[PDB]
Amino acid sequence: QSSLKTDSLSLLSFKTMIQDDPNNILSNWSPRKSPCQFSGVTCLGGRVTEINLSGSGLSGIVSFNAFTSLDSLSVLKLSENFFVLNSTSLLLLPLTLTHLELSSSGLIGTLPENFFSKYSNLISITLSYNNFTGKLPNDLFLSSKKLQTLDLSYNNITGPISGLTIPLSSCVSMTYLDFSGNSISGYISDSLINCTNLKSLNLSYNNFDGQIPKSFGELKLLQSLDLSHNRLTGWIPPEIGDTCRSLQNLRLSYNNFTGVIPESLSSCSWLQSLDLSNNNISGPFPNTILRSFGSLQILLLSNNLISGDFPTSISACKSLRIADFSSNRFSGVIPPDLCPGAASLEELRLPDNLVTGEIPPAISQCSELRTIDLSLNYLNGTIPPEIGNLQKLEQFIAWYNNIAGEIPPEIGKLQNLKDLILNNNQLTGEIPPEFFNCSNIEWVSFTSNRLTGEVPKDFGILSRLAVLQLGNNNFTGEIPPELGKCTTLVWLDLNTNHLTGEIPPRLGRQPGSKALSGLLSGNTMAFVRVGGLVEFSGLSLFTRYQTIEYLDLSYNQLRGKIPDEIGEMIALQVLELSHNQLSGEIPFTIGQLKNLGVFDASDNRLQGQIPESFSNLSFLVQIDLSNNELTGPIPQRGQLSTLPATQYAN
Ligand SMILES: *[C@@H]1O[C@H](CO[C@@H]2O[C@@H](C)[C@@H](O)[C@@H](O)[C@@H]2O)[C@@H](O[C@@H]2O[C@H](CO)[C@@H](O)[C@H](O)[C@H]2NC(C)=O)[C@H](O)[C@H]1NC(C)=O
Ligand SMILES: *[C@@H]1O[C@H](CO)[C@@H](O[C@@H]2O[C@H](CO)[C@@H](O)[C@H](O)[C@H]2NC(C)=O)[C@H](O)[C@H]1NC(C)=O
Ligand SMILES: *[C@@H]1O[C@H](CO)[C@@H](O)[C@H](O)[C@H]1NC(C)=O
Ligand SMILES: *[C@@H]1O[C@H](CO)[C@@H](O)[C@H](O)[C@H]1NC(C)=O
Ligand SMILES: *[C@@H]1O[C@H](CO)[C@@H](O)[C@H](O)[C@H]1NC(C)=O
Ligand SMILES: *[C@@H]1O[C@H](CO)[C@@H](O)[C@H](O)[C@H]1NC(C)=O
């Protein structure tokens, strides 16, 4: 009863409602032009069928009454458009609609009744990122035989789902279902079993309580289950294994699940992602499920209570790239056969466990290892020299263990090493010379070991070193002034060693300088206002004001005066030099350290008066001038007077 006689009129009725066309999509929407050539419109057989204005950024106050007469419209894609629209307007759409994408389209209001049960030709429904407050319509699942894809994710939908009746005969096409990002409450419905062809079910980021239903085992075709970030409790039901003929992604993280990991997951030979992290899962880890996970790429178990020996069957996971056991009760040792079994292992994380034993040298045979974290365990032995074969290793983290021996010189073969964190171990010896071929190292932490020798001068050739922590060792000698060549060092910790001599004038990143290690660090470049910036042989605002920010030198045997070049480290915030043998006056340049916040110069032998330049230290919240030989009227301007008097004793 209509033709383009009515369709072309309908499309231009929409242009009237539009009050802003940022990209001018509706520019060619003219009655002199046919709707078949209208931007974003498609016809089949002469009548309008599709109208795609998604992402166009259109802005208006629109109503869907300008589509009703379009009784040939099968696709309606108006996603990502800044126009207001009432939720009841869904009922004014053509019943010939099959696809419907209204993501971030500006819908407001509770979902209307008699829409999902009315539009019985919709196969795909995406109404995500709107404001459908309130509950779901009772008719949501009553007559949707052909609905395959229902995405109502990321609204403010509240209320329960266990009230919705789901007839077996009306949820037969449903494969993709996404209600994530809402405030839906109550127990997970046992009725979702009736959607027998579910392949993807996502209910993450809601307020579901109660247990994972045993009925979910009946979703034989399920490939992807995400119940994460809810309040689900209880044991992971073993029936879930009855979906293992299809399951590829299982996400139960951020709930409060107790009990053991079900052994039935040993049949999930197609599993690719397993995230049980951030629960209270406990009990002996069933090693046998790992022998079936030949296709597993991601294993997230962190932040649980999982006990038992660290699983030795992890060598069967030939596809595993990420293995995260952080914060569990794993005992035993690191399996020596982990490698080359886990041939694609890239991140091995098991900090905060009860794992003992040595680091197996075979771990060098996991060729793809990028990150190793073994901290807060009970490991012994020595760092195997074979560790230098992990050419792709960027993090070796193993602080708070009982590792002994010397630092193997083979570490210099790690050209990609960026973080070497070994503090609170029992490493002895001198820092090997070959260690300094790690030119890309950014964070070195040797705190609280038994290292001896002197701080090597070759710490200056490391142009990317940002944090250096050597505190509480048996280092001797003088502070190498080469440390002042580091163009990026901003944190220096040498406290509690047997270091003598003076304090070098310039240390760490100096005013100016930049991380760049090529031509852009020199000045051979030229400005030519075919170029603009050329390398003729013979910028960096803000960053040229960066310098050391944390300098702890306390509890050593240093002598001499405090240099006045330390006043040029404007970005300094913490300056702890207490318990040395320093003398002389306090430089007036200290007042230039505006952002200084901590100044611990106790148990030295300083003399003179305190410069009133300290008044400019607006951010000084802690000072400590105990056990010195100072004298004079303490500058009352600033915070120095607001600080306690015990910081000026003796
Ligand atoms: C590194 O330590 C292991 C730790 O083994 C046991 O576990 C600890 C929690 C603690 O109770 C230790 O005293 C235990 O020994 C040592 O492994 C033992 O090694 C001895 C031989 O020296 C052997 O007879 C034990 O059976 C081993 N125990 C095991 C495997 O549980 C290991 O010797 C230590 N390595 C080094 C190089 O000192
Ligand atoms: C289930 O829903 C979420 C909703 O966001 C999907 O998106 C990812 O989920 C994480 C969970 O922390 C969000 O923070 C991220 O924004 C999303 N990450 C991406 C797209 O990489 C999530 O993927 C869905 N899960 C499954 C198994 O389909
Ligand atoms: C599935 O639907 C049938 C009718 O189609 C109904 O009898 C049954 O109770 C439903 N199952 C649920 C709600 O778990
Ligand atoms: C989670 O389970 C643990 C272990 O049984 C329990 O102590 C805790 O109270 C639970 N937390 C919540 C938030 O339900
Ligand atoms: C176990 O429940 C406690 C209860 O407070 C919660 O803090 C914690 O997240 C859960 N366990 C872990 C390991 O996260
Ligand atoms: C880095 O230094 C070590 C020791 O001198 C050497 O074996 C290694 O080959 C050097 N660099 C590279 C890229 O191999």
Domains of the chain: 1-108 (3.80.10.10)
Question: 491: part of which helix (H) or strand (E)?
Answer: strand 491-493
Report which of 123, 120, 170 is spatially closest to residue 150, judged by C-alpha positions.
123
Q: Which residues line ligand 6 (CB under 6 A)?
A: 412-413, 415, 434, 437
User: Is the N-terminal amide bond of 340 cis, ω within 30° of 0?
Assistant: yes
The closest-lying atom of ligand 2 relative to the alpha carbon of residue 181 is 4
Report which of 91, 102, 103, 10 is spatially closest to residue 48, judged by C-alpha positions.
10
Q: Which residue's alpha carbon is at the smallest distance from atom 11 of ligand 6?
A: 413
**The 3-state secondary structure of 497-558, one letter per residue:** CEEECCCCCCCCCCCCCCCCCCHHHCCCEEECCCCCEEECCCCCCCHHHCCCCEEECCCCCC
From 276, 279, 301, mutation site for ligand 5 pocket: most ligand atoms within 8 A of C-beta: 279
Ligand closest to the CA atom of residue 176: 2
What distance in Å separates the CA atoms of residue 297 and residue 273, rounded to the nearest whole number?
6
Report which of 632, 626, 631 is spatially closest to residue 646, judged by C-alpha positions.
626
Q: Which residues line ligand 1 (CB under 6 A)?
A: 356-358, 380-381
From 191, 197, 214, 216, mutation site for ligand 3 pocket: most ligand atoms within 8 A of C-beta: 191
445: which strand partners? Answer: 421, 469
629: which strand partners? Answer: 607
What distance in Å separates the CA atoms of residue 29 and residue 66, rounded to the nearest whole number?
14
Q: Is 142 in the pocket of ligand 3 (CB under 6 A)?
A: no
Q: Which residue's alpha carbon is at the smallest distance from atom 9 of ligand 6?
A: 413
Question: 15: part of which helix (H) or strand (E)?
Answer: helix 4-17
What are the counts of helices (DSSP H) followed by strands (DSSP E) for the chain? 2, 44
Solved using: X-ray
The closest-lying atom of ligand 1 relative to the alpha carbon of residue 381 is 37
Q: Which residue's alpha carbon is at the smallest distance from atom 4 of ligand 6?
A: 434
Q: CB neighbours of 238 closer than 8 A, spacing ≥ 6?
A: 262, 263, 264
From 393, 437, 458, mutation site for ligand 6 pocket: most ligand atoms within 8 A of C-beta: 437
Distance 256 CA to ligand 4 centre (A): 6
624: which strand partners? Answer: 600
**CB count, 10 Å around CB of 622?**
15
Report which of 104, 99, 208 is spatially closest to residue 154, judged by C-alpha positions.
104
Distance 386 CA to ligand 6 centre (A): 14
DSSP string, 246-305: T--EEE--SSEEESPPPGGGGG-TT--EEE--SS---SB--GGGGGG-TT--EEE--SS-
* Dihedral, 588, 593, 597, 598 alpha carbons, nearest 10: -50
DSSP string, 368-433: T--EEE--SSEE-SB--GGGGG-TT--EEE--SS--BS---GGGGG-TT--EEE--SS--EE---G
Q: Is 580 in the pocket of ligand 5 (CB under 6 A)?
A: no
**CB count, 10 Å around CB of 147?**
26
Q: Is 190 in the pocket of ligand 3 (CB under 6 A)?
A: yes
Distance 131 CA to ligand 1 centre (A): 60
Ligand closest to the CA atom of residue 145: 3
Token digits of residue 597:
């916040």
Q: Are strands 99-101 and 428-429 parallel, antiparallel or unpaired?
A: unpaired
Q: Is 193 in the pocket of ligand 3 (CB under 6 A)?
A: yes
Q: Is 72 in the pocket of ligand 5 (CB under 6 A)?
A: no
The closest-lying atom of ligand 2 relative to the alpha carbon of residue 251 is 27
Distance 189 CA to ligand 3 centre (A): 11
